[PDB]
Amino acid sequence: ISLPNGMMAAFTGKDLYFCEPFIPHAWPEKYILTMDYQIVALGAYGTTIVVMTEGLPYIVSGTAPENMQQQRVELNLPCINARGVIDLGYSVAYPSHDGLVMAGSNGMQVITEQLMTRNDWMKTGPGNIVGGQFNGRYFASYEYIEPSGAAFSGTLIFDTTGAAPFIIRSNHK
Amino acid sequence: TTLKLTAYSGEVPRTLPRLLPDTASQRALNVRLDNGGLTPTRQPRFEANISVDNAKTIYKHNGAWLAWQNVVHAAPGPVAQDRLYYMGDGKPKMIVDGTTYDLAVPMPTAAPALTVTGTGTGNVTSIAYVYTFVTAFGEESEPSALSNVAGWQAASAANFVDTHATNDFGEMLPSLEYNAPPDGLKGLISLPNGMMAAFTGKDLYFCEPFIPHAWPEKYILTMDYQIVALGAYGTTIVVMTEGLPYIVSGTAPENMQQQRVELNLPCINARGVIDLGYSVAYPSHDGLVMAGSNGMQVITEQLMTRNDWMKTGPGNIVGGQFNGRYFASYEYIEPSGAAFSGTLIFDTTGAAPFIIRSNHKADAFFHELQTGALYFLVGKEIFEWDALGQVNETLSWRSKQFVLPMPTNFGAILIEGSTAASEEEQAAYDAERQRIEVENATNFALPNGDMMQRLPAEGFVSVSIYADGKLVKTVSKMNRMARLPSGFLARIWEIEVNSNINISDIVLATTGQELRNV
């Protein structure tokens, strides 16, 4: 992913790597930061990075690759799907087992907890959520099979803009 | 004179029963209140069995289940390779590839420093060992050795070296500040910037930032009172003590500054500590309190009494987290010898926090973070919480004591709702039927066997009405108006709802024509 001050962020199986600020090909070993748990995907709001892990999400705040300080975030939710991560522009939303949750400058909030149940999110299936952004709306494509051989395929659009957030469904897998 | 029960809410025991909110109710047991109805909890399923009896802490690493007889805290290490550091078992110890080692690395084993002023000018001489520096585990320990020459304290004559094991001649700034993890360190938690936190009886220890095994003595921080457990919110640690809780703020182990917190409440139970993600909650004598970024708030002071919190018993609260809810398991003996066992779930999310009760005692709790699902040990087995593929459990919901302005008797009940139509509940019921048939077959072949042949389950609705503390009727008709008994006039009415299926709402009226009105 690209970063504000000019740099690139990459992760190994468990360690994140920071490239030379204005030199892309260089990936110094002294720039690397090691995090607990595996790393699924990376997102950025403002200057701070969202280190999205199989365990506790981590927030790395830095004006420079040398000046990096990872920080705990207000929610402890794993990142199940790497592809479900979408930079919605105002937040970084990654599907989780508890539900879709957005990481932004203002705070860390589980949008679906307001508008959808734990059971429905499990039945939708966070493992294979295809994510996308349109007009600041999170496009989630779900294709899961109900027991006894019933298959549901559709697109779940999440819009938080408005008086109250709601789900706009679609049927384009 | 209609009383209508819709949009059910949880239990708030710090309130007189008549003064509860309009949709708040007592004994919210085995109920999940999400959509606004009585959605039943699923029955736990037996996933795996534990080896050693009387397990107080359970953990899962990779596919295997780990349990220990002591309160053991385990967290992944900052190092790249997958490592588990669990230290509650007396001596700090480490698991690598399913093999347990000791976190402490013996001194004078991996690193030795020899220096002399006469070196590099005269051959031979030397004194074998001058100073023994601290050892470094790195990835392989007690296998390789490192030697450095600290002359006048990098590239020169290698000279003689010890032949005890394989050695390397590297000349870099020696990291002699490493120290072996002292015995008695109990609680280990992970930290943002990358480091480990552990505490002695009264002193907290800080490790080398990216080196888990090193526990330098200059990093240690001493606090007043004993230390019970550790929790982290943001970059700042919550030092939970037998006295005044302390907040340690720091970007690095060297730059550490402990701070007094806005509440003075001791931590009674170490196991009651759960990192709920948005705060760290530790049971206290006054009540359950969580430390968060916004501040320090005692949730129970809003929703529970001092008396009830004492009667529940904060000393032996088993704590757990599911969907951001604090699962507290309580087992206490009220006077004259009656045992109360159950699970108290605390959810603060919503307009007003409330207690959702459950009746599954848990010897220990484990929240598998990768796949969110609580694992609790009861009867020496591992059970999940409301796992998918199980039949719904019976729901208990006893309404607020409705003190009608005038004494009346009710003549209508409308129990709305739907039967099993999700087909996931139906599939779970079919699987339960298959298990019932299998046990029927295996018990039917006994050399014979009296009784057994247990009856299969069923979906029911059972609403019981308490007139003035006396059960007058139990109604099971659903989606169609039912009738109460007669001949009794009461003004303190309350409703208890029992069902394996979800129920939309309950409305009562003295006449069907009044039920027409609302």
User: Which DSSP string do the residues of B37-74 spell out, in sequence order?
Assistant: S-EEPBPP-EEEE-SSSS-SEEEEETTEEEEESS---E
In degrees and rounded to multiples of 5, residue B4 shows phi and psi of -120, 130
Q: Which residue of B has its CA nearest to A39?
A: B80
A115-135 residues labelled b (16+ CB within 10 A) or e (exposed): bbebbebeebbbeebbbeeee
Under an 8 A CB cutoff, do B82 and A14 touch? yes
Nearest to B313 by CA among B292, B295, B329: B329
Tell me how crowded residue B421 is: count the other CB atoms within 10 A of its CB. 8
Q: Provide the shortest C-alpha distance from residue B208 to chain A (in Å).
A: 14
The residue with tokens 């007592």 is: B26
Under an 8 A CB cutoff, do B190 and A36 touch? yes
Cα(B293)–Cα(B289) distance, integer angstroms: 13
Cα(A129)–Cα(B335) distance, integer angstroms: 54
Tell me how crowded residue B165 is: count the other CB atoms within 10 A of its CB. 11
Cα(B146)–Cα(B135) distance, integer angstroms: 9
Residues of B in contact with A61 (CB under 8 A): none
Nearest to B510 by CA among B413, B411, B408, B405: B411
The residue with tokens 């917190």 is: B261
Under an 8 A CB cutoff, do B193 and A70 touch? yes
Q: Identify from A30, A31, A36, A38 which residue to disrupt to test chain B contact, counting B C-beta atoms within 10 A and taking the largest count.
A: A36
Tokens at B390, concatenated: 């199980």
Tokens at B298, concatenated: 């005692």
Nearest to B273 by CA among B258, B254, B288, B251: B288
Sort A105 into a burial class: Cβ within 10 Å, 0-12 / 13-18 / 19+: exposed
Nearest to B111 by CA among B181, B153, B161: B161
Nearest to B32 by CA among B279, B299, B278, B325: B325
- Give the up-direction half-sphere exposure of residue B303: CA atoms within 13 A in the CB hemisphere: 24
Q: In what order do the strands lie in the sheet with B189-190?
A: B189-190, B196-199, B203-206, B221-222
Interior angle at CA B471, CA B420 and CA B3, nearest 5:
70
In sign, the C-alpha dihedral spanning B307, B311, B316, B319 is: negative
Cα(B173)–Cα(A142) distance, integer angstroms: 55
Element (H, E) at B444: helix B424-444
Residues of A in contact with B502 (CB under 8 A): none
What dihedral do alpha carbons B210, B221, B191, B101 form, nearest 10°? Answer: 60
Instruction: Dump strand ranges (E) for B139-273.
Output: 144-147, 166-169, 189-190, 196-199, 203-206, 221-222, 227-233, 236-241, 246-250, 256-260
Q: Which residues contact B178 (CB under 8 A, 6 or more apart)?
A: B134, B135, B136, B208, B211, B213, B214, B215, B216
Minimum-distance CB partner of A148 among B276, B388, B427: B427
Q: How far is CA B309 from CA B25, B109, B251, B300, in A?
A: 19, 53, 37, 8
Cα(B333)–Cα(B341) distance, integer angstroms: 9
Q: How far is CA A147 from CA A169, B380, B387, in A?
A: 22, 31, 15
Pairing of strands B166-169, B144-147: parallel
Residues of B in contact with A150 (CB under 8 A): 423
Amino acid at the residue B58 = I
Under an 8 A CB cutoff, do A33 and B293 touch? no
Tokens at B341, concatenated: 């066992």
